[PDB]
Amino acid sequence: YSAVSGRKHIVVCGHITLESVSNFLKDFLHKDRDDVNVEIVFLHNISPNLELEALFKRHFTQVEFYQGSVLNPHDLARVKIESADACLILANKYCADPDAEDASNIMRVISIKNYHPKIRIITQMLQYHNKAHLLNIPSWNWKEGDDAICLAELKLGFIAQSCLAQGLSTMLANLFSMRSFIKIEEDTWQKYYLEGVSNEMYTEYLSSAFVGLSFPTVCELC
Amino acid sequence: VKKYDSTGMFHWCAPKEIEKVILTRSEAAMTVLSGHVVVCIFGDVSSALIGLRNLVMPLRASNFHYHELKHIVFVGSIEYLKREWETLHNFPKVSILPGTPLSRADLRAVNINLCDMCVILSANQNNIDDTSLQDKECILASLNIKSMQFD
Amino acid sequence: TPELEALIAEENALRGGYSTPQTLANRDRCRVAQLALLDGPFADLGDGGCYGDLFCKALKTYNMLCFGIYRLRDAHLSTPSQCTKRYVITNPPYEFELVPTDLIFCLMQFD
Numbered sequence A: 001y002s003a004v005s006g007r008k009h010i011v012v013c014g015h016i017t018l019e020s021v022s023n024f025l026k027d028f029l030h031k032d033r034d035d036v037n038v039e040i041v042f043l044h045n046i047s048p049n050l051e052l053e054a055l056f057k058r059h060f061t062q063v064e065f066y067q068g069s070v071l072n073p074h075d076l077a078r079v080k081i082e083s084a085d086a087c088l089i090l091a092n093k094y095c096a097d098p099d100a101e102d103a104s105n106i107m108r109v110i111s112i113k114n115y116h117p118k119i120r121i122i123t124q125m126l127q128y129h130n131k132a133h134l135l136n137i138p139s140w141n142w143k144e145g146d147d148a149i150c151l152a153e154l155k156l157g158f159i160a161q162s163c164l165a166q167g168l169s170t171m172l173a174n175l176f177s178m179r180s181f182i183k184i185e186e187d188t189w190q191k192y193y194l195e196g197v198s199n200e201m202y203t204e205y206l207s208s209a210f211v212g213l214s215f216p217t218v219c220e221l222c
Numbered sequence B: 001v002k003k004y005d006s007t008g009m010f011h012w013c014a015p016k017e018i019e020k021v022i023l024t025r026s027e028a029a030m031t032v033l034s035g036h037v038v039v040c041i042f043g044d045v046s047s048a049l050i051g052l053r054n055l056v057m058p059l060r061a062s063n064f065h066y067h068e069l070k071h072i073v074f075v076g077s078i079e080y081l082k083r084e085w086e087t088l089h090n091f092p093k094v095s096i097l098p099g100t101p102l103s104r105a106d107l108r109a110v111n112i113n114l115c116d117m118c119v120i121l122s123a124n125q126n127n128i129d130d131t132s133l134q135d136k137e138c139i140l141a142s143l144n145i146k147s148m149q150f151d
Numbered sequence C: 001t002p003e004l005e006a007l008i009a010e011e012n013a014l015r016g017g018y019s020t021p022q023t024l025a026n027r028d029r030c031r032v033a034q035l036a037l038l039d040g041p042f043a044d045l046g047d048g049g050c051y052g053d054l055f056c057k058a059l060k061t062y063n064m065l066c067f068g069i070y071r072l073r074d075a076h077l078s079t080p081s082q083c084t085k086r087y088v089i090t091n092p093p094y095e096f097e098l099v100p101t102d103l104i105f106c107l108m109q110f111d
């Protein structure tokens, strides 16, 4: 890869396959987001097949591929990880044995942190107890951005919260899939639900006019 | 009273039953250990048997004054240790704490911040043919101690 | 909270403790709950059908935040039925019509 001044880029490695990449890209480059200028640089040690190559050709101007292994420092230097803004890892949810997957992911994290101790990492984990091990890596600063997503914990938590009030699982899960408004004119239940689903969640610093006011007051007037 | 060996080469003592040296997390807290040696193993039932006698023996040699010895504390699976306990019973000043070396509580219970050395070994390294997963335990355990925080 | 984050690293479990006045101050967190418009302070608005009015009133009165409607599936059909399945509507616009057979998610206060 050749770094381009004034433009960030990220590095994605892990379980690269057709459906996973399609889902990730479709969600990432959605129009509802603000203007984006980040290049995506994959990294895998298996030559892609024709379907995957066709997908990359379709997203020609903003996706690049490089064959290699994430455990090799030469490869890590090849994809220019020092100036990379963040590094992602994708996990195989439908694996036969969960523990092997967690072991592989932990090894990848250790290797990346060895090569560089200040990068920011986002990952996936299949069991709760395995997540505890990541707290022992010397340079795993979770006070800054360094996030592990435990699928089991989140899933069971969603269900448990649904126990108190029903429908909470759906209502939450629709807040993270960026969707555009869809209009249907015939009158059924689907119309209002489709109007609702179009929402997402965003964060932003407040204006200076609200510094001295009370929280309920500023929750109003907005 | 028999103190040295038959051949006058090592320190010797009467055999002792295993339960007289097993400690608990609370129990080891009251005892104060300084300048000792802590040994971590990853064995279990049905694994290759490394001969721990060759390790402890050089420490408990002669030409060491009785007050000059180094206390030894094992940390690991009690099931594994019982298999070879008979060989090490004669050696003096040996103590065993059941636990896991990854459990950060145990490494605090024994005063690891006041130690002379900390050996880490493996047992089933030959059994596994998966190169990536080989030596995962030893690597991970070593890094754990690196990130420790002390007052 | 970070305190739970740090402690869980050491022992990977929990330990019973003793209540202290500063500790009991941690029992102040909003929780999730459901309301029914059939009866209560808001039963008047059940037929009125102004989502915004309830929103402003609820927040000022009880510091309740209401951000969803869990509506009966066939409440929009003139013909009657007996199906009791419902769906979710997230963040409705200000000028939305309501019916007495409606449930709304809310965030309770503590005590």
Ligand SMILES: [Mg+2]
Residues within 6 Å of the ligand: A061, A062, A063, A064
């Ligand atoms: Mg390009």
